[PDB]
Amino acid sequence: SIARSSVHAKWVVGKVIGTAMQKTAKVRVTRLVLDPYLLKYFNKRKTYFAHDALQQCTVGDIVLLKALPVPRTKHVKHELAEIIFKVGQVIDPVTGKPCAGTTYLESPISPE
Amino acid sequence: MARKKVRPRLIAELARRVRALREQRERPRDSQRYALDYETMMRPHSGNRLPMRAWADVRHESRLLQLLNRLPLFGLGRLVTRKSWLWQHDEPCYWRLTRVRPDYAAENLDHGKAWGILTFKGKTESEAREIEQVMYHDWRLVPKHEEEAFTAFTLVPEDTPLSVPYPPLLRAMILAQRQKYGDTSTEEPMLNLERARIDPWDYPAKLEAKTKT
């Protein structure tokens, strides 16, 4: 059962930047870093490459990434796991209903 | 560790290949490597001077190959003894030669590597091991009529104790632990001196290494 990885990040969540290359999406991960002087947290942006076998990435999505056990090249070290939020097509994880921002597209209290 | 300004050095790899190629092509032969001057006791090749404890044996004995060349098949199946074991051990110690390949560089054919079967203190091993310390000027050859005289051995059982008392401070902790945990037996602890058998220092070591088992 040896399927570990040498990278420090096993699971990360980032926003898709572009899908120009073939079967690979460039995503932007955001993390909070404490400024030593002001003692305040600011976002730090880093770019990651994720392999999408099904070509399901659209610019503006939020995608969970899983650490790749073996790197495929010097840059692609992560593999796409799921599409957390499709752009424009967002379903509430609680009620399982389509929504557009704040207004529900479909009323959850109307089964029929 | 790595950086973005890594320069692809190539001369270091180039030197490694040539240096490795040179030693393989220019590998010193056993005759010229072990050729020795018998007056200055200095090795012309390595520039080393032998210790004074070995000066007497060089001039008053011959090495293995000097006493092995004048044999039909270079003494296959013969028994070869060594002066080192004879002086210190009353029990017979000898080697049963399996194969031997001398080097053709020597004009007198007095060098080479040989294998054999080990018989130390009457104990015989079931595997062939390469003969160590061949170049030493202490080897001797047994006659045909004396082959059975040395072969016959009288097995003497060992009288060494199989258990010894523990060291005093370490013995106390053994008693303390079992008393603390509830084991109140007053039997004196003993150390099993059975797995710690030590071969004598003169026993030759395996020249070949050991692979993963």
């Binding site: - | 002086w87 210190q88 010894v164 008392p165 060291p167 005093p168 013995r171 106390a172 008693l175 303390a176 008393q179 603390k180 007053t186 004196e188």
Partner: protein, 83 residues
């Protein structure tokens, strides 16, 4: 020095006892049973004492180390006197 003699007052914090359980039962503080070699007076190991080697072994060593041999000595004294 004055504080060490009690002539001057200074703060003395309250200190808890050093140990949690006060038990003298353990063998570290209680006397352990004597070793069988201790009561007899024999040395803890047989090779601690001096034993006269066989004469055959002495002859073998003299032959091996001939020329650079040194004068031998007997058993060491049991007790060393004082000058």
């Amino acid at each position: 020095k004055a504080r060490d003699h009690g002539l001057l007052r200074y703060h003395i914090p309250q200190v808890e006892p050093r140990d949690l359980d006060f038990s003298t039962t353990h063998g570290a503080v209680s006397s352990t049973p004597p070793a069988p070699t201790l009561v007899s007076g024999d040395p803890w190991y047989p090779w601690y004492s001096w034993k006269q080697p066989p004469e055959r072994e002495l002859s073998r060593l003299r032959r091996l180390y001939q020329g650079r041999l040194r004068e031998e000595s007997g058993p060491p004294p049991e007790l060393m006197p004082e000058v």
